[PDB]
Each structure stands twice: as structure tokens, then as C-alpha cells.
């Protein structure tokens, strides 16, 4: 060894001379020796530290198409990339643009030497990201996703993950290169844990993108990610779940979701809190405005599973909020909505749902819960139970608070109206009044509502500048007007004047309810 | 002698698991 870092050093200028030889026959001889001088502790640091070498070696690899020297050279750089000095040395000689050129090599051993070295550079060499992007490694790597060696694909997809992370430039190019569809293809074809994991990471990164999102969805990403939710690997399952939650708001138009939806429902009974949370989140977005998904979730026991999720979550609002939102979506506008409304009651959900209206619940959960209660009230069998649990007094109380807050802002807190815990009080005013409108279909509920002296407030809400509020207020007043005593109170309260003006509202809903109140009040 | 697939197998062995 005492002559390695002494003779090889005096040998460096030697082989370096041969690598630049014009004779395409002996240049191969050095390539072999040089490669050998990459396996010894000394020779390695000899060439690696010999800028002259690195440069020639790199130039050789790319130039000589000789399917024999291409690997000796490529094989040299790779041995150097296991050392920081090597990575840096390779980076300075411009090896990256070369290595990227070799990604097109039909000689597997060269291909493998290229992708593994680039991976090392992208993993520990600052500046590598720019260079690879510069040389156009992105489109190259996306093209190589058509290969079938799984360890190779795992390396390649990891590189793409490194290059894409937090960079829309790379992401755009990946998209244009047809990356999404290729990535989804891998998820539905292979079973090599490491590969699925690394690929799910690239998808996770792209799923937070605006342009990549709808692309992954169209490629069938939802269904494919859904294939691995039952896999033994926890990191794979969790990565698929996060990516799925990100895509879920742009996948409300997909077909063949039966399998995914059924799996999500069963995932609600998981021992892992994090899986439960994501699952509820994903179901909430997939059942928003999609009657088909709503019918499916209900069909596989979604209602019972969600009520159980709410019970198990306790005071953990990151779980109850989306679970309660899903339940809201499932209890209206679809063929089985009525079955869903009944099932919530049959599975002992009414008590827990009304309790959520009380502290320690914060506003976002409260807002979601008021909406669910409005839907539950569409089922006449839920009126007495909802009333027994104290729903009306709490809804009215919430209504009064939110309305006053909007009054302490009619002056100037900041702007027209801002938020409180992420919720505008105008939405609580609308939600509560809307819940009371439906509940008021019941004669007994009307007695309670009227008894709390709400008519004066409801009338003032007709002057609200917010159309949706004017509409639910007129709505609840119309329901209450069917009782003579309430009808006289509404009139004594001066509702006729404002109702008469609302007949001209630009909002059909508002004009209709206003007119309905007046008719109910006329023909008594 | 050595299968040009050991290059990947080895790499994977060190970068991750």
C-alpha cells in the first residue's frame, strides 16, 4: 500500500494520457486499468483527486460508443460517487450531462451505472438538481419508466422525487412527459414494496400541484392508489392515503370507485388514528356533490362506520369534523338519503351529534354539525328525538351569539366581515336558521321555537344583505306562519313591509319564500 | 462474472434498506 499512493500517483498522468489516445483500441486498455484503480483505497483517491483523470474518464464514456469501454468508464465514476470528494469531482468535470446521455444506453450495465451515480449526486451533491434538470434528465427518467427491472425503477422514481419536490418547473415537465400516467401504471402493476413506496412519494409530491392533480386523476390514480391500502407496509399505506386526500377534491367525477370507497369505509375501523383521520377526510371529499359515491358508501355500511368514528374520536376535532361532513353529504340529495337519515338515528347517532354543538367544540366542527342536523331533520322520525336532546335551544343560542357578533362588526372590526377560528359568523347565522327552518315543519318544534321568542330576530334577518340568510329566515317564518298565533306575532313585528319588498328579490328562493309567508298570513 | 444487476442490488442496499 506504501507504493499505491506513491506509484499510482505517478501512474495517474500515465493512464490519463492513454484515455485521450486517438487509437480506438488501446483507449479501451486504460479504461479497464482505470476502472481497477477505482477499487483500491489509494488509486480511488488518486484518480478522484486527479482532476485530469475525472475529466478524461467522463469525456471517454460519452464519446466511445464501444459497448465495452462505456461501462469501464461509467463504472469508474460510480465508485467515486461513494465519496464526497468523488461526487464533487464528478460534478466539476461535467459528468452529469454525460451520465444523463448514458441513460439512453442499450447496455443495461451502463444504464444502471448511470442512474445509480446520478442518484448519489442528487442525494449528496449540492447543485446536482440544477445540472440534471439542465441536461434534461427529467424527460429522460420519465421515458425510462417503461423498463421492467424493479430495483432500477425504484432508483429512477426516487430521483424524480428528489428533483420534483417543491419545484413546479420539474413538475410541469414531468406532466408534459406523460409522467402521471406512467407512475399510475407502476402502482397498478408491480408488488416490490420499495418501488411502490418510492413511486407513491413522487405522486404525493405531484398531487399538491394544480396541473398534475387532474392529470393523475384522469390517469386513474385514485383507483390505483386504492389497490395498496391493504398492503402490509405501513409507510406505503400512509403515503397512498396522503396522496389520495390531496387528489380527492378533484376526483368527484370518476367511475369504478366501488373498490376504493369500500376500502376507505373499512379503514375507519383501523387501530391507527392517522389512517382513520385520512380515511374520513377522503370520504368527505368523494361524497361531496357525487350522488353515485354517496349511494355506494351508504351501501357498504358507511353511515354506521362514520357514527362509530365520531364516537371513537371524542374531542379530536381533526377526526370528527370530516366524519361529520361526510355524514352531512350522505344525508341529502341522493336515492338513499332517507335511509341514511334513519340509519343515523338507528345507530344511536342523534345524541352524539347534538352534543357536538356544545363546548369544547370549536366553530368549524359546529358549522359542520349544524348542517348535518338540518339534513337529519328532513326525516320526520328524527324530529322528536332531535327535540328531546335539546337541539332547538342550542341552535337558537348559537344563532343569537353569531348574529350579535356580526352586529359588533357592522361598525368595523376590520372589513365587511372576517373570520373567527376560520369561520364567518354569517355562515353560522345561515346554518342555524336553515336548521330551524326544516325543524319547524313539526308542530311541537314550532311551539318550542316560538316559545324562545325568536320571531323578532327572524324578521330582522329579512333585512340581511346576505341573500341566503334572507332565504332561510323567510323559510322559517313561512313554516311558523301556519300557526295563527305565530302569524299574528310576525305581522305585529312589522314583517309585511319587508316581505313585500322581497317579492322583487333577484334570488328566486327568496322571492318564493317571501310570497309563501304572505299567502300563509293572508288566507287564515 | 458479476451480474450487472448487483450494481442496483448493492446501491439499494445502502441508500435506503
Amino acid at each position: 500500500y506504501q507504493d499505491d499512493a506513491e506509484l499510482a500517483t505517478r501512474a495517474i498522468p500515465e493512464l490519463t494520457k492513454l484515455l485521450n489516445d486517438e487509437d480506438q483500441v488501446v483507449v479501451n486498455k486504460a479504461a479497464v486499468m482505470v476502472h481497477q484503480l477505482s477499487k483500491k483505497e489509494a488509486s480511488r483517491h488518486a484518480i478522484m483527486r486527479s482532476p485530469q483523470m475525472v475529466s478524461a474518464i467522463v469525456r471517454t464514456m460519452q464519446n466511445t460508443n464501444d459497448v465495452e469501454t462505456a461501462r469501464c468508464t461509467a463504472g469508474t465514476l460510480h465508485n467515486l460517487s461513494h465519496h464526497r470528494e468523488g461526487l464533487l469531482a464528478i460534478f466539476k468535470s461535467g459528468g452529469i450531462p454525460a451520465l444523463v446521455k448514458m441513460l439512453g444506453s442499450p447496455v443495461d450495465s451502463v444504464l444502471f451505472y448511470a442512474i445509480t451515480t446520478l442518484h448519489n449526486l442528487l442525494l449528496h451533491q449540492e447543485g446536482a438538481k440544477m445540472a440534471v434538470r439542465l441536461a434534461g434528465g427529467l424527460q429522460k427518467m420519465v421515458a425510462l419508466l417503461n423498463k421492467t427491472n424493479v430495483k432500477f425503477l425504484a432508483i429512477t422514481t426516487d430521483c424524480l422525487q428528489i428533483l420534483a419536490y417543491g419545484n413546479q418547473e420539474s413538475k410541469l415537465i414531468i406532466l408534459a412527459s406523460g409522467g402521471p400516467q406512467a407512475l399510475v401504471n407502476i402502482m397498478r402493476t408491480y408488488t416490490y414494496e420499495k418501488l411502490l413506496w418510492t413511486t407513491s412519494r413522487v405522486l404525493k409530491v405531484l398531487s399538491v400541484c394544480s396541473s398534475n392533480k387532474p392529470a393523475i386523476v384522469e390517469a386513474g390514480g385514485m383507483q390505483a392508489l386504492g389497490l395498496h391500502l391493504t398492503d402490509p407496509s405501513q409507510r406505503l399505506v400512509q403515503n397512498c392515503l396522503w396522496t389520495l386526500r390531496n387528489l380527492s377534491d378533484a376526483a368527484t367525477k370518476q367511475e369504478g370507485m366501488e373498490g376504493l370507497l369500500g376500502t376507505l369505509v373499512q379503514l375507519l375501523g383501523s387501530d391507527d388514528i392517522n389512517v382513520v383521520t385520512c380515511a374520513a377526510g377522503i370520504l368527505s371529499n368523494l361524497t361531496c356533490n357525487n350522488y353515485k359515491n354517496k349511494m355506494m358508501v351508504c351501501q357498504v355500511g358507511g353511515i354506521e362506520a362514520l357514527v362509530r368514528t365520531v364516537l371513537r374520536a371524542g374531542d379530536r376535532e381533526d377526526i370528527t369534523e370530516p366524519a361529520i361532513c361526510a355524514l352531512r353529504h350522505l344525508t341529502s340529495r341522493h336515492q338513499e338519503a332517507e335511509m341514511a337519515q334513519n340509519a343515523v338515528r338507528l345507530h344511536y347517532g342523534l345524541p352524539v351529534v347534538v352534543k357536538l354543538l356544545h363546548p369544547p367544540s370549536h366553530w368549524p366542527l359546529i358549522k359542520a354539525t349544524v348542517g348535518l342536523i338540518r339534513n337529519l331533520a328532513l326525516c320526520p322520525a328524527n324530529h322528536a328525538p332531535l327535540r328531546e336532546q335539546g337541539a332547538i335551544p342550542r341552535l337558537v343560542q348559537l344563532l343569537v351569539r353569531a348574529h350579535q357578533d356580526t352586529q359588533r362588526r357592522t361598525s368595523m372590526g376590520g372589513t365587511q366581515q372576517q373570520f373567527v377560528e376560520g369561520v364567518r359568523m354569517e355562515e353560522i347565522v345561515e346554518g342555524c336558521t336553515g336548521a330551524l327552518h326544516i325543524l319547524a315543519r313539526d308542530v311541537h318544534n314550532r311551539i318550542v321555537i316560538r316559545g324562545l321568542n325568536t320571531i323578532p330576530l327572524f324578521v330582522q334577518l329579512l333585512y340581511s344583505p346576505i341573500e341566503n340568510i334572507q332565504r332561510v329566515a323567510a323559510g322559517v317564518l313561512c313554516e311558523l306562519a301556519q300557526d295563527k298565533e305565530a302569524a299574528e306575532a310576525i305581522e305585529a313585528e312589522g314583517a309585511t313591509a319587508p316581505l313585500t319588498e322581497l317579492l322583487h328579490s333577484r334570488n328566486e328562493g327568496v322571492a318564493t319564500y317571501a310570497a309563501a309567508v304572505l299567502f300563509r298570513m293572508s288566507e287564515d | 462474472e458479476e451480474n450487472p444487476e448487483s450494481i442496483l442490488d448493492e446501491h439499494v442496499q445502502r441508500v435506503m434498506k
Side-chain angles (χ1 to χ4, degrees), chain A residues 1 3-5 7-9 11-409 412-415 417-524, chain B residues 1-16:
Chain A
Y1 184 111
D3 65 298
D4 288 62
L7 183 58
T9 55
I12 293 298
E14 188 62 57
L15 295 178
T16 302
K17 293 176 181 297
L18 188 53
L19 263 303
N20 302 303
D21 190 297
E22 279 65 298
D23 172 58
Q24 288 298 64
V25 182
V26 183
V27 180
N28 315 63
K29 257 292 184 298
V32 182
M33 295 177 266
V34 177
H35 184 57
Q36 301 167 56
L37 293 180
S38 300
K39 308 163 190 173
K40 287 186 174 59
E41 299 289 300
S43 58
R44 190 184 306 173
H45 290 56
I47 305 175
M48 172 191 82
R49 293 168 179 172
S50 176
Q52 302 177 181
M53 275 291 260
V54 180
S55 180
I57 299 176
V58 175
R59 296 198 287 81
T60 297
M61 182 178 86
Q62 60 198 304
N63 293 308
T64 174
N65 63 62
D66 174 57
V67 297
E68 193 167 57
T69 297
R71 67 168 306 164
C72 305
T73 51
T76 302
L77 302 171
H78 176 249
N79 285 168
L80 303 178
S81 61
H82 296 179
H83 302 298
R84 297 179 184 62
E85 322 83 77
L87 293 180
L88 176 56
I90 300 175
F91 179 57
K92 296 166 295 183
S93 72
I96 282 175
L99 295 168
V100 169
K101 181 179 182 178
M102 299 300 88
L103 292 177
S105 170
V107 186
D108 279 0
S109 57
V110 172
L111 216 193
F112 303 169
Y113 269 154
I115 198 66
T116 284
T117 301
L118 290 178
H119 190 211
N120 288 328
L121 292 170
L122 290 175
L123 280 176
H124 314 303
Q125 188 54 49
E126 63 185 309
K129 296 187 184 184
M130 286 190 71
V132 172
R133 292 192 185 79
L134 300 168
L138 289 173
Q139 166 62 73
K140 219 67 172 293
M141 302 182 140
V142 169
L144 295 175
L145 296 179
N146 291 298
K147 297 304 183 182
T148 55
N149 178 298
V150 296
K151 291 197 175 189
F152 167 72
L153 294 170
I155 308 299
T156 308
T157 51
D158 196 56
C159 290
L160 282 172
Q161 183 259 167
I162 289 179
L163 300 173
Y165 189 61
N167 183 307
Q168 282 196 298
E169 302 80 284
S170 305
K171 298 186 185 182
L172 279 176
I173 290 174
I174 290 181
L175 174 56
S177 301
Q181 179 56 284
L183 294 163
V184 174
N185 285 180
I186 286 177
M187 299 302 299
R188 51 200 312 192
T189 306
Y190 306 94
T191 62
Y192 182 45
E193 196 290 333
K194 294 182 184 301
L195 173 63
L196 294 167
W197 175 56
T198 292
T199 298
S200 65
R201 284 172 44 174
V202 174
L203 286 174
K204 175 192 171 178
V205 172
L206 293 172
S207 65
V208 305
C209 164
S210 64
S211 56
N212 275 288
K213 176 182 278 55
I216 299 174
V217 176
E218 304 317 301
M222 301 303 271
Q223 294 85 174
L225 294 164
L227 295 178
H228 306 283
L229 296 177
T230 290
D231 277 45
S233 177
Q234 260 48 292
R235 62 171 175 174
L236 174 53
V237 173
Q238 188 57 63
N239 264 295
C240 291
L241 286 174
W242 285 319
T243 313
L244 273 174
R245 184 165 54 180
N246 302 331
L247 297 168
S248 65
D249 73 315
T252 62
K253 298 170 294 300
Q254 284 288 168
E255 305 293 299
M257 295 290 264
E258 309 68 47
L260 173 54
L261 293 171
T263 302
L264 289 183
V265 170
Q266 67 179 60
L267 285 179
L268 290 170
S270 171
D271 287 305
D272 184 308
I273 323 166
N274 291 164
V275 169
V276 182
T277 298
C278 278
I282 302 169
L283 284 163
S284 187
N285 299 333
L286 299 184
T287 60
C288 184
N289 263 58
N290 192 307
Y291 75 93
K292 298 179 179 181
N293 292 347
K294 300 188 180 192
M295 282 176 61
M296 238 316 282
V297 169
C298 280
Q299 278 169 34
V300 302
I303 299 290
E304 190 185 307
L306 285 167
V307 171
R308 290 174 181 292
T309 294
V310 178
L311 270 342
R312 170 189 192 295
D315 68 9
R316 292 172 289 192
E317 303 182 56
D318 287 329
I319 302 173
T320 57
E321 220 245 71
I324 284 296
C325 279
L327 286 166
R328 185 179 65 244
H329 297 165
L330 301 172
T331 45
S332 82
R333 306 178 316 182
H334 76 91
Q335 287 180 50
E336 293 306 301
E338 181 180 55
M339 156 265 129
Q341 292 158 16
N342 234 70
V344 174
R345 171 178 50 82
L346 299 174
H347 292 291
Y348 311 74
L350 296 194
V352 70
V353 167
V354 174
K355 279 159 59 293
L356 292 182
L357 289 183
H358 304 279
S361 290
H362 298 274
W363 286 114
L365 169 60
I366 288 183
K367 171 167 164 291
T369 301
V370 164
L372 171 60
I373 292 180
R374 182 269 181 189
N375 287 357
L376 288 180
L378 296 163
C379 177
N382 288 330
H383 293 154
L386 246 18
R387 180 176 62 250
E388 292 167 48
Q389 299 305 309
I392 295 178
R394 180 53 177 171
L395 287 176
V396 166
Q397 184 178 303
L398 285 168
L399 172 56
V400 171
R401 301 186 189 302
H403 178 61
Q404 296 174 315
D405 292 353
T406 67
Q407 293 265 292
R408 309 180 194 300
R409 298 172 175 179
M412 171 170 241
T415 50
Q417 270 300 56
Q418 82 292 63
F419 315 71
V420 178
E421 289 182 353
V423 177
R424 277 172 286 180
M425 293 299 96
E426 306 71 89
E427 299 183 69
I428 298 303
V429 169
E430 190 189 318
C432 290
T433 303
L436 294 169
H437 168 34
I438 305 303
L439 247 11
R441 290 177 179 182
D442 181 74
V443 72
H444 299 295
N445 290 337
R446 292 200 289 282
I447 294 172
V448 175
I449 291 170
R450 178 166 63 277
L452 297 173
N453 182 55
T454 55
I455 285 174
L457 176 53
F458 291 142
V459 168
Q460 279 290 150
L461 291 179
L462 297 171
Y463 294 91
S464 169
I466 302 172
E467 288 185 346
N468 282 330
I469 285 169
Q470 286 179 130
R471 183 175 174 172
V472 290
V476 66
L477 286 175
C478 171
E479 292 294 352
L480 297 178
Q482 76 190 83
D483 298 325
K484 200 61 156 46
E485 182 164 336
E488 301 181 330
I490 297 174
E491 183 189 67
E493 204 56 41
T496 295
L499 288 167
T500 298
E501 299 306 293
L502 292 179
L503 286 178
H504 292 281
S505 178
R506 297 173 80 263
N507 181 299
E508 322 279 26
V510 169
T512 304
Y513 287 152
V517 180
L518 293 169
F519 283 129
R520 193 94 78 176
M521 295 188 281
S522 283
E523 45 238 57
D524 287 57
Chain B
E1 289 291 350
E2 55 185 55
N3 183 177
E5 194 173 306
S6 62
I7 172 277
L8 309 173
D9 281 55
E10 174 258 324
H11 183 71
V12 174
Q13 271 286 64
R14 46 192 287 78
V15 294
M16 190 54 71

